[PDB]
């Protein structure tokens, strides 16, 4: 009773000329390439010591890619994708402790195209110590999923936000948390 | 900002039912969402899924080895990236963390892996079918899941049932 | 053991 | 990373049976896929056959190869040689996690006499 | 089928030559191939849809160009002498290594001093 699915994702964006190559096993990432230091980066740093991945041949398929979206827009007269906004949903990896070391979940779901601004505010005020995201995901509808994660020592006096910006919203989306 | 974007997207499936056991290979090409073109395993051939993929069906038939080749992708491919990360993704098991705590107007299983679970509420020592509130399976992104059972109405007992054990876990309060 | 990319196709022109 | 086939010129009498050796060093490359490409006199060089899966075997034109796990072979023999076999055979691999890149052998002459 | 030009050249060392080559299989991926006069064959280069992959520490003398998916063409700047040699083209469907590559008849390179 094994049922799963291994994707192997691809996408190249004009005129931003960003790409990206990623493997989903279950709707869980395996591995990326970082185009820019062409170097296969595991989602679980023990994957590394267990298989191998030659990154040079995403950076072989993406050029293709990129060829094939010139293309392709020809063939479509130049016919632009339509914006999508994001659903934003923010939640914590366990139940909240005072004083006990916890990470804020930053989820973005169900947007294109892949180009977003994420940043998290602690009290208002930006916050960048520790944070940590992921690439973007894909979905059976082809749009695109993202991860963002802040951690941090919950405290009735710190009070958290999740700004998000996209084309496709009229103005920054703002999801609020806090502790009771 | 005001620019247009343009997107093409690329998807090699390979889903799997039973193990490797029976294999189906899917070549997917995107523009914007849209797929234009798609190998089917069970098909053999490329196909035009829209009028936009249609001379590449064409063409990419027409090459020399490509039928061969895409035809062997549930072997050369699929079968073998099965094998490659079996060891860590097939057969990876995380068991929960369950805590049990009241809330004011609640079973919490966090950080398991894979998704398939089934939680109950004993109350007690007979399952309570009415009340639950179950927040579903939500993943972390981090190859772990975390779920939400909640029950207003004793002992009470949360029964966490998950590959990862052989037997059942319960939490009481 | 070692992932397999399976390589993109050129677009027909 | 490397390939040793038979060296030089081997010359056989038709209907006698054949084996040119070749092994592999698997020293980086995990799981290799194996060929043996044939160039005919005056023609250009061609594949003869290929194994992509480690154990199977590969034949054409009444040649067999292979796959030899344990061994690190890939032996190529024939039965019963004729005359129109005569040309130049290379055994070769080709790393299966990258890029295609043939590595061959030096190349094994077979002057198959009436 | 795979073409390739010149199938001789004579050339003093120094000077320039160009080899061109054309496939029509319909392939992405053709490379360059070295057969030295001990006819051990040796990669050169990998290209893949006018973009090289594969460069096996060839001296800058060389130069492939590829302006088109089914076109390689290569040129070496100033010959030396051990650029003597057959140069085979070859093309193959993609770059996966499972794919049978289509070898050319080969140009027959000789420079002398």
């Known amino acids: 009773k094994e049922e799963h699915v291994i994707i192997q994702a691809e996408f190249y964006l004009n005129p931003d000329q960003s790409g990206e190559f990623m493997f989903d096993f279950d709707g869980d990432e395996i591995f990326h390439v970082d185009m820019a230091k062409k170097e296969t980066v595991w989602r679980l740093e023990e994957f590394g010591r267990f298989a191998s991945f030659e990154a040079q041949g995403a950076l072989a398929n993406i050029a293709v890619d990129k060829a094939n979206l010139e293309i392709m827009t020809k063939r479509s007269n130049y016919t632009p994708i339509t914006n999508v906004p994001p659903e934003v949903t923010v939640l914590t990896n366990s139940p909240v402790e005072l004083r006990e070391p916890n990470v804020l979940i930053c989820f973005i779901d169900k947007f294109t195209p892949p180009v977003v601004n994420v940043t998290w505010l602690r009290n208002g005020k930006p916050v960048t110590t520790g944070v940590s995201e992921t690439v973007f995901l894909p979905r059976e509808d082809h749009l695109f999923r993202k991860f963002h994660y802040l951690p941090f020592l919950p405290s009735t006096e710190d009070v958290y936000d999740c700004r998000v910006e996209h084309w496709g919203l009229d103005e920054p989306l703002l999801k609020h948390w806090e502790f009771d | 900002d005001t620019r247009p974007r343009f997107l093409e997207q690329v998807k090699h499936e390979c889903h799997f039912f039973n193990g490797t056991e029976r294999v189906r290979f899917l070549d997917r090409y995107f523009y914007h969402q849209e797929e234009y073109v798609r190998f089917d395993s069970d098909v053999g051939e490329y196909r035009a899924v829209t009028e936009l993929g249609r001379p590449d069906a064409e063409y990419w038939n027409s090459q020399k080895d490509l039928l061969e080749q895409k035809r062997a992708a549930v072997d050369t491919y699929c079968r073998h990236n099965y094998g490659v990360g079996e060891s860590f993704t097939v057969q990876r098991r995380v068991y929960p963390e369950v805590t049990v705590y009241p809330a004011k107007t609640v079973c919490s299983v966090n950080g398991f892996y894979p998704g398939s679970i089934e939680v109950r509420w004993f109350r007690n020592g007979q399952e309570e079918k009415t009340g639950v509130v179950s927040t579903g399976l939500i993943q972390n992104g981090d190859w772990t899941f975390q779920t939400l059972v909640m029950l207003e109405t004793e002992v009470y007992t949360c029964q966490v049932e998950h590959p990862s054990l052989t037997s059942p876990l319960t939490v009481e309060w | 053991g070692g992932y397999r990319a399976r390589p993109a196709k050129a677009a027909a022109t | 990373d490397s390939v040793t086939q038979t060296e030089g010129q081997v010359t056989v009498s038709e209907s006698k049976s054949l084996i040119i050796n070749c092994t592999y060093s698997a020293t980086s490359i995990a799981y290799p896929n194996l060929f043996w490409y044939v160039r005919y006199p005056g023609e250009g060089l061609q594949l003869l056959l290929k194994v992509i899966t480690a154990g199977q075997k590969g034949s054409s034109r009444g040649f067999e190869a292979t796959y030899n796990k344990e061994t690190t072979s890939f032996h190529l023999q024939k039965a019963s040689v004729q005359e129109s076999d005569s040309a130049v055979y290379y055994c070769?691999?080709?790393?299966?996690?990258?890029?295609?890149?043939?590595?061959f052998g030096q190349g094994t002459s077979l002057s198959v006499v009436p | 089928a795979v073409f390739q030009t010149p199938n001789y050249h004579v050339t003093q060392v120094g000077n320039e030559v160009s080899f061109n080559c054309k496939q029509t299989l319909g392939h992405d991926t053709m490379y360059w191939y070295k057969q030295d006069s001990k006819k051990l064959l040796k990669i050169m280069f990998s290209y893949n849809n006018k973009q090289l992959i594969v460069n096996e520490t060839v001296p800058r003398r060389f130069s492939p160009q590829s302006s088109d998916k089914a076109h390689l063409n290569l040129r070496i700047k100033s010959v030396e002498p051990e650029d003597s040699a057959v140069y085979l083209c070859?093309?193959?469907?993609?770059?996966?290594?499972?794919?049978?590559?289509?070898f050319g008849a080969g140009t027959r390179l000789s420079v002398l001093e």
């Open positions: 070769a691999l080709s790393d299966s996690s990258s890029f295609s890149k043939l590595v």
């Open positions: 070859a093309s193959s469907l993609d770059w996966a290594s499972q794919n049978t590559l289509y």
